[PDB]
Amino acid sequence: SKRYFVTGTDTEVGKTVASCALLQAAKAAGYRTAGYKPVASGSEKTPEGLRNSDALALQRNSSLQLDYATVNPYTFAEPTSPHIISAQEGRPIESLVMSAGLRALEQQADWVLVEGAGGWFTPLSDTFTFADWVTQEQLPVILVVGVKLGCINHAMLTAQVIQHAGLTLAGWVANDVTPPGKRHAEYMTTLTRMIPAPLLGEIPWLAEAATGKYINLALL
C-alpha cells in the first residue's frame, strides 16, 4: 500500500480535518483506504469501550468497513501525553503492536493514512517517542499547518527535524483555522517558500465536511 504519516505543527491546526480531506480525496481516486491512529488519548466512554473522536473520524472516512480497534489499538481516556497515561494505567504501548496493526491494514487497504497522537516528539514511553516508530517504519510525512503567524516558526522547526531524521517530507496541507485575516496571503507565501515539500491544498475556514476536493493527490 502507499502509506503516509500525518503530523501537525501545533495542537490547534485541525490535523484530523486535513486527515479526513486526505482520505476523501484518496477514495475519490479509487483507492481502498484505511485510517490508522495507533495511539489516542482523550476518549469518551461508550457501551463498547473508549472511542476517541479523531479515530472515529478516520474510521468513518475510510472506504473500507473497519472495526474500531483496527483503526485505534490504544485508546486512553485522559487527554494527556501517552507515556503518562500508559504508565498510570499499566498498559505499555508496544512498537510491535503498532507495527502489526499497520500490516493488518496493508493486507486490506492499498492507501493507508497514519495519524500520530500529538506533535512530532510525542513520548510513548520514557525511552521511545512516536518519531522513533515513524523513523523505524520509514513513513513519508505530510505536515498540516494552520495559517497563522506562530506556525511559520513551528512549520520550519518540524520540517527541519523530519529531514534531519532522514525521512521524506511528502507535502504539506494549509488549514485555515481562523476567519480571513489581514496577512493571509503573505503568510501563505512565506510558508510555501520555506517548507521544502509540495503544498497539497488549502482547507478553507469552516466552523467544522466534503473536503476531499481541496486536496491535489497528484502531488503525492
Place this chain on the structure above:
Amino acid sequence: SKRYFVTGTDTEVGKTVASCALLQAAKAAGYRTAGYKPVASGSEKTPEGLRNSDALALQRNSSLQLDYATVNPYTFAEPTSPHIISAQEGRPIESLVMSAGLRALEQQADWVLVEGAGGWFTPLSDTFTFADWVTQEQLPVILVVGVKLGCINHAMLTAQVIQHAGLTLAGWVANDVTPPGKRHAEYMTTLTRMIPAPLLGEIPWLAEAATGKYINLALL
C-alpha cells in the same frame, strides 16, 4: 560582557516575564545589565514614537539607564512577522545595525540579555532569519517553556534545531502559564529529562513582579 539570547517555545509562554526575571537576578548578582530587543513589531504610538511593551519592560528592568532606541533599534506598529512589515514600510532590517546595537550595549553593560521578535525561525528578510543573526553572533541560548502539554513537543523541536546550528543551549526557564493543573509534575519531569541544558528556575503563575528570586543564575 556575558551575553545570552532568549527564545520561547511558543507565543504564549511569557518570554518577557522570564526576561525580566533573568535581568532582575543578574542585577541582584551585581552585574551592570542591559536588555536588548533589536526587532519588535506590535507597538503603541506615543509623542516620542513607537514603543513596544516588551522592549519597555527590558528597558525598565536594566540596571543601566538606557534610551529606548538603544534597547530597541527597530520598532514596527503592526504585530506581524518583521519581514512582512519591514518590506511594507520600506525599512530593511540590517544585520550590521543589529550587531552595532549589541556592541554599543557591551561598552556599558557587562551582562546583556537579547530577546528576539517571535520564535527561533522569525524571518527578517526573504533571505535572512533571526536564527542566522544569533548563529553569526554565536550567542548562548536560553529557552523559555510554558508548562503545558504541547510544549513538550515544541521544546524538543527548538532544542534540536539550536544544537544542530552548533549553538550552545545555556539553559531553560519553566513558566507557569496556567493555574496549577493535574499533570504539572509529570510535565516538569518530562521537560527536565528531554531538554539537554540546566533548568534555571520556574516562574509561578501570577496574573502578570519581583521574579528574580525564581532564577538560579549560578547555573549559567
